[PDB]
Structure 1
Amino acid sequence: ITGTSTVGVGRGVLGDQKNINTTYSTYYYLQDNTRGNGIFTYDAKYRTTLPGSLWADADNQFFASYDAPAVDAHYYAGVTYDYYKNVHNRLSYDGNNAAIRSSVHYSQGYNNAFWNGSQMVYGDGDGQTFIPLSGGIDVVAHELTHAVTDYTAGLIYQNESGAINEAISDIFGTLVEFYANKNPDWEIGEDVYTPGISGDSLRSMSDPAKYGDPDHYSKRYTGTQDNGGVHINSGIINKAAYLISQGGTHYGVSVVGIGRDKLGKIFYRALTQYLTPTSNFSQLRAAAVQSATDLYGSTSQEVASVKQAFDAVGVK
């Protein structure tokens, strides 16, 4: 809407206070004009019609329980925008400052979040499996990264290309989590998953097998569930990315870590310059090797470490 940029204050899903960029025109709307062509957050009102209503608030204070998922969707979308702009010189998901839209309170007891081709969408969870999913910065950045992928590599959401698609979202979701530097880790969704169980998460990049996901190509899932295992075989690529960044020895294969920033540079370049809609795991390895070669040279430790990491997960 047309109005003047304002700064509200609220509490997120985990009870943390934060300022949010709003817009004033009769009401205070969750519309952040300070980033690109805007970040807009909507109320889906427990229904499934999208996007719903642009979030309006009478007093610019967002401390009600019902406000918390909106506060976090809005704020963490801003953090993710900042990461792509400041770290990769990328202006929003299309590279041309496209408006970023999110809807919260999607459906009733909805244990998921997603990018629908046009916007991010967050369930509230059923209170047992999940609390409102926008409470997880890695979750928010995972979903917005699907938009980046849609506009760049375009990895088809099935089989190996879809597992790369998922891994790309987990990798950058985690790198955004580290960029915000609150409580960062190599796990996915720990802040919103199972409020009654401490120490777990949806997936682990450091040890995908902890949650039943493969950590080696020989253990890949080949059935039809989950679009051919896109959230399962992502563990093979997640483990390789973890190894590139942090190093380690895995199935007897030693990898020299090069750190999170170089991992992000290599995979961002692969995503935007080399990967295609049909790329498989072997093609991702080639794309990552070529990206590391572009950035650091063919004789570099970075190229050597990328090869070691894909070797360790059985991807040639």
Structure 2
Amino acid sequence: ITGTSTVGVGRGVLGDQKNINTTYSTYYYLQDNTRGNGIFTYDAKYRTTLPGSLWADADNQFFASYDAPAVDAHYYAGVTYDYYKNVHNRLSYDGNNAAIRSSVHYSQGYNNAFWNGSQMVYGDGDGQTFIPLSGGIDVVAHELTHAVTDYTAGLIYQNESGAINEAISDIFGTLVEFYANKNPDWEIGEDVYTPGISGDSLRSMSDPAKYGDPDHYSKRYTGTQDNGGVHINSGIINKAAYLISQGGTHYGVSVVGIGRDKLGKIFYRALTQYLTPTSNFSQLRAAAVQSATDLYGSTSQEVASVKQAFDAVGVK
């Protein structure tokens, strides 16, 4: 809606206090006018009708436990916006500053989050497997990254192209986690996953096999569950991306790490200029090699590391 830009203060899902950009018009709304065409956060009110109600608050203060997921979805959307803009010169997910919309309190005990083709959507979780999912910055950025991929490479959500889709969201979710620099790591979902158990997560890029996910092509899943294993075989690519950045020896293949920034650069370029909707793992390797070549030259260390990492995970 129309109104004045203001600044609220609230607490996130993990009890942390933070400032949020709000909009004032009778009520204080979760509308950030500082970023692109705006970031809008809605209340789905435990139902599944979307988007639900633009979040309205009487006093620009967001400390109620009910507020917390909206606080983080709003804040973390802004962080992710900043990453793509400051790091990749990308303006929102479509490159033209499209409004970013998120709904929270979707359904009841909903242990999931997603991009619905138009907006982000976060369950509260059931309190056992998940607490409210927007509490995880790598979750928020994974989801918004799905929007980026949809507008760019458009990787179809199935089989190897689908697993590439997932890895890209896991890669950029992690890189955004590092960008904000609060407890960053190469795990996925640790901040909102299983509040009863410390140290675990939904998936691991550093060691996919920690959670039953393949870390080598020879161990790929070939059946039909999970749209041909898009959340499973992503481990192969997650591990490759981990290797490219951090380095290491994997199945006896040594990889010289080149760090986060360049991993980001190579993959962002791969995603936006070389991947197509039907790209398989093998074409992803080629896309990444050509991206590293464009950026650093065909005889560079960067190129040699991309090749070593994909060799390491068994992708030719």
Q: Same fold (TM over 0.5)?
A: yes
Q: Shift of residue 191 of structure 1?
A: 0.1
Deviation of 1:40 after TM superposition, in Å, equals: 0.1
* Correspondence 1:226 to 2:226: yes
Question: What stretches of structure 1 of length at least 5 have no aligned partner?
Answer: none
Shift of 1:24: 0.1
- Secondary structure class of the residue paired with 2:67: helix
> Offset at 1:169?
0.0
- Partner of 2:101, secondary structure, is strand
Deviations 1:44-66 (A, max 9, x none): 00000000000000000000000
1:75-108 CA distance string (max 9 Å, x none) = 0000000000000000000000000000000000
Deviations, residues 196-255 of structure 1 (Å, cap 9, x unaligned): 011100000000000000000000000000010000000000000000000000000000
SS at match of 1:65: coil
- Structure 2 length as normaliser, TM-score? 1.00
Unaligned runs of 5+ in 2: none
Question: Offset at 1:21?
Answer: 0.1
State how far apart, in whole Å, the 1-side matches of 2:231 and 2:27 are.
40
Q: Aligned-pair distance for 1:3?
A: 0.3
How far did 1:12 drift?
0.3
Structure 2 residue aligned with 1:165:
165
Q: CA deviation at 1:17?
A: 0.1
Residue 183 (structure 1) shift: 0.5
Deviation at 1:43, TM superposition (A): 0.1
1:136 shift after superposition: 0.2
CA–CA distance in 2 between the matches of 1:152 and 1:264?
Answer: 16
SS in 2 for 1:106: coil
Q: CA deviation at 1:153?
A: 0.1
**Does the residue aligned with 1:121 lie in a helix, a strand or coil?**
strand
Give matches, 1:112-191, under 5 Å: 112-191=112-191
The alpha-carbon deviation at position 163 of structure 1 amounts to 0.1
Kindly report the root-mean-square deviation, in angstroms, between the aligned alpha carbons of the 2 structures.
0.2
TM-score, normalised by the number of residues in structure 1:
1.00
How do residues 28-47 of structure 1 correspond to structure 2 at under 5 angstroms? Answer: 28-47=28-47
Cα deviation, residue 171, structure 1: 0.0
Deviation (angstroms), 1:162 = 0.2
d(CA) in 2 for partners of 1:208, 1:68 = 31
Query: 2-side partners of 1:315 and 1:8: how far apart?
Result: 48
CA distance in 2, matches of 1:35, 1:308: 39
- Separation in structure 2 between the aligned mates of residue 139 and residue 13 of structure 1, nearest angstrom: 13
Deviations 1:134-192 (A, max 9, x none): 00000000000000000000000000000000000000000000000011000000000
Q: Deviations over 1:262-285 (max 9, x none)?
A: 000000000000000000000000
Query: What displacement does 1:25 show?
Result: 0.2
1:70 CA displacement: 0.1
For residues 262 and 156 of structure 1, the distance between their equivalents in structure 2, rounded to whole angstroms, comes to 26
Q: Give the whole-Å Cα distance in 1 for the aligned partners of 2:106 and 2:50.
A: 9
Aligned to 1:15: 15
Q: Deviations over 1:1-40 (max 9, x none)?
A: 0000000000000000000000000000000000000000
**CA-CA distance at 1:68 after TM superposition:** 0.1
Provide the rounded CA distance (Å) in 2 between the counterparts of 1:218 and 1:206: 18
* Secondary structure, counterpart of 1:291 in structure 2: helix
Shift, 1:133, TM fit: 0.2
Distance, in Å, in 2 between the alignment partners of 1:62 and 1:227 is 39
CA distance in 1, matches of 2:309, 2:179: 23
Aligned residues: 316
